[PDB]
Design a binder for this molecule. Structure first.
Ligand SMILES: C[C@@H]1C[C@H]2CN1CCn1[nH]c3c(cccc3c1=O)-c1nc3c(cccc3[nH]c1=O)O2
Length: 290
């Protein structure tokens, strides 16, 4: 695009390369994403109006010469990078709680307009120097079906995928994003991925080994799911005190509700914001080197 000048390749999203670039017009630095059916066009345009402080802002959509470029506000780094860097001492609890609180606000907003992210993961959570965190690539999934492999052939991570998606439910709800965020919450606290599956069945079985194999008791209708197999091994449910120490009682109570098997029992983003865990929530400034 004539109006932009690439500064550097800052990443590789699911749909295309992402560059940090400068707008020759406004002089603003931005994140340029390379990705055209009419349906995707209408969908992307809807995204230009769902603005929230905790959602990476979609500045412009350039559909030129049968190509799609999405211009997004630029945010210095992602959460994955910050997490790896904080592997030795871990992200202090006050900051973890602040990030979770902000993410829940971003989700509550999106879910109120019936938009789901569908693919939340540390990598698409962006953080700035002022203590804020924002959801990136929000809504791109419905527009462009999230594939098994990226344009670069990298395997899309299954670690944050909700069980209903894994079991074949085709009309999953906003609850899938709460599941993902819960997995991220646990990972920030323990400094280790909660369910690092490397295939759909390994992903499903890791979930089962920690939370117990779901049945009609905890999840009515589960046995009727498309990919549910009566032959799934029967694992006992582990205790959360063992899964996410040293997270306190309120935190464990909240995480448990975010990880409920039944999508209808799983806590909503809105209800999560009123949880006592956030009673003493604050907004501290992180220690990140740019
Ligand atoms: C955000 C995820 C991960 C990587 C590829 N992304 C996936 C593709 N992608 N990248 C996006 C960005 C901003 C806004 C929206 C998107 C987006 O959808 C930016 N992306 C990135 C980044 C990695 C390290 C720093 C920045 N900074 C950014 O500003 O992208």
């Amino acid at each position: 695009m004539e109006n932009f000048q690439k500064v550097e390749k800052i990443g590789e999203g699911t749909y295309g390369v992402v560059y940090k670039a400068r707008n020759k017009l406004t002089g603003e630095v931005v994140a340029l994403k390379k990705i055209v059916p009419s349906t995707a066009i209408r969908e992307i345009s809807l995204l230009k109006e769902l603005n929230h402080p905790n959602i990476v802002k979609l500045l412009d959509v350039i559909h030129t010469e049968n190509k799609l470029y999405l211009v997004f506000e630029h945010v210095h780094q992602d959460l994955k990078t910050f997490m790896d860097a904080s592997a030795l001492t871990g992200i202090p609890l006050p900051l973890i709680k602040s990030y979770l609180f902000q993410l829940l606000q971003g989700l509550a907003f999106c879910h109120s307009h019936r938009v789901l992210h569908r693919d939340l993961k540390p990598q698409n959570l962006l953080i700035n120097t002022e203590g804020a965190i924002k959801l990136a690539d929000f809504g791109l999934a419905r527009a462009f079906g999230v594939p098994v492999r990226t344009y670069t052939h990298e395997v899309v991570t299954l670690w944050y995928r909700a069980p209903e998606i894994l079991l074949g439910c085709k009309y999953y709800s906003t609850a899938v994003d709460i599941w993902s965020l819960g997995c991220i919450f646990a990972e920030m606290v323990t400094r280790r991925a909660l369910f690092p599956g490397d295939s759909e069945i390994d992903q499903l079985f890791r979930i089962f080994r920690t939370l117990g194999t779901p049945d009609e008791v905890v999840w009515p209708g589960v046995t009727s799911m498309p990919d549910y197999k009566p032959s799934f091994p029967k694992w006992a449910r582990q205790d959360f005190s063992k899964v996410v120490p040293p997270l306190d009682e309120d935190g464990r109570s909240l995480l448990s509700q975010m990880l409920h098997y039944d999508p209808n029992k799983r806590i909503s983003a809105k209800a999560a914001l009123a949880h006592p865990f956030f009673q003493d929530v604050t907004k501290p400034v992180p220690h990140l080197r740019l």
